[PDB]
Amino acid sequence: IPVTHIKCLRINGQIKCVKPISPNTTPAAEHIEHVRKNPRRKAAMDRAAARIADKIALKAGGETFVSLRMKKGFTQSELATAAGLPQPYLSRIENSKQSLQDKTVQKLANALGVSPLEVRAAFERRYEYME
Amino acid sequence: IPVTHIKCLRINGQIKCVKPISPNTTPAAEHIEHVRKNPRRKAAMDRAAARIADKIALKAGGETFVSLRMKKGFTQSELATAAGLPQPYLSRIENSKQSLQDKTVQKLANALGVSPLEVRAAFERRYEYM
Ligand SMILES: NC(=O)C[C@H](N)C(=O)O
Numbered sequence: 001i002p003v004t005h006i007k008c009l010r011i012n013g014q015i016k017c018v019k020p021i022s023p024n025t026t027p028a029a030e031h032i033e034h035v036r037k038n039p040r041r042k043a044a045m046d047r048a049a050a051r052i053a054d055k056i057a058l059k060a061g062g063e064t065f066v067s068l069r070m071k072k073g074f075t076q077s078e079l080a081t082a083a084g085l086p087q088p089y090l091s092r093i094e095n096s097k098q099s100l101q102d103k104t105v106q107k108l109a110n111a112l113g114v115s116p117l118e119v120r121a122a123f124e125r126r127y128e129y130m131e
Numbered sequence: 132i133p134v135t136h137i138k139c140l141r142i143n144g145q146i147k148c149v150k151p152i153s154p155n156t157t158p159a160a161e162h163i164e165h166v167r168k169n170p171r172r173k174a175a176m177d178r179a180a181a182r183i184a185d186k187i188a189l190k191a192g193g194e195t196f197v198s199l200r201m202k203k204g205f206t207q208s209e210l211a212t213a214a215g216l217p218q219p220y221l222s223r224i225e226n227s228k229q230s231l232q233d234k235t236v237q238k239l240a241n242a243l244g245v246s247p248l249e250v251r252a253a254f255e256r257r258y259e260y261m
């Protein structure tokens with residue numbers, strides 16, 4: 001039953017203790033990136049993503065955040081890059097997160113070229129409402 | 132400015148409101164999987180992963196959780212499948228999370244075939260002690 005002291009970053013009303021190590025370029029990521037560099041390959045993938053996004057929308061109640069990302073032809077990696085976000089954080093936005101800050105909605109809206117309302121409406125499909 | 136009521140799942144002292152839909156196959160995931168189905172390709176990638184894992188360990192103080200995963204030749208997808216975990220949760224384990232439940236450490240230790248201590252020591256490299 002021990003105690004140990006760790007250095008943490010306090011940056012404007014927010015504590016950051018965890019330092020996730022950041023080597024963006026991993027072989028699997030590197031691979032898909034090279035595959036998508038061919039426009040003919042990219043399209044083939046895109047059409048598959050769209051078809052799968054339909055199955056997601058129907059299954060889930062309507063357009064989800066992932067669903068929408070897929071129909072616009074963005075891999076999670078591509079969208080993360082387009083929207084000035086880290087991919088881990090984007091993964092959380094697609095799967096785990098309960099809300100989005102306004103600034104993020106806008107970054108994402110711009111990246112995908114759709115309205116804030118669209119982004120927000122998609123995000124909110126992870127819930128089950130009742131009226 | 133109204134109020135909208137949402138249905139949430141309460142399951143043994145834990146609330147689950149968010150439903151992240153799960154059809155497990157996307158084209159990018161599908162692609163790498165097929166690429167890794169060739170053992171000759173898998174190896175080429177594995178050797179690259181290991182080399183990159185070295186740069187990670189040196190940069191970061193020692194073996195990190197990602198580092199370790201890479202040296203054993205597991206893509207995040209592969210390790211998530213091997214350890215009976217969801218890949219979103221695994222991504223959070225590698226990047227965001229502050230601790231691991233004992234049950235998880237064990238699931239992971241088994242998947243990678245290393246000790247709990249190794250898993251734990253790796254995870255703890257995301258901090259700066261003194
Ligand atoms: N999250 C962090 O990076 C905190 C760390 N102690 C630092 O050097 O800033």
Ligand SMILES: NC(=O)C[C@H](N)C(=O)O
Nearest residue numbers: 128139140147148149150
């Ligand atoms: N997220 C889940 O696992 C289920 C969801 N909480 C529901 O509405 O039942």
Ligand SMILES: [Cl-]
Nearest residue numbers: 073074075078
């Ligand atoms: Cl693109």
Ligand SMILES: [Cl-]
Nearest residue numbers: 092096097098
């Ligand atoms: Cl989260």
Ligand SMILES: [Cl-]
Nearest residue numbers: 116117118120
């Ligand atoms: Cl809006």
Ligand SMILES: [Cl-]
Nearest residue numbers: 129130131136
């Ligand atoms: Cl009601």
Ligand SMILES: [Cl-]
Nearest residue numbers: 128130138139
């Ligand atoms: Cl009900």
Ligand SMILES: [Cl-]
Nearest residue numbers: 075157158159
């Ligand atoms: Cl994809």
Ligand SMILES: [Cl-]
Nearest residue numbers: 026027028206
């Ligand atoms: Cl990898």
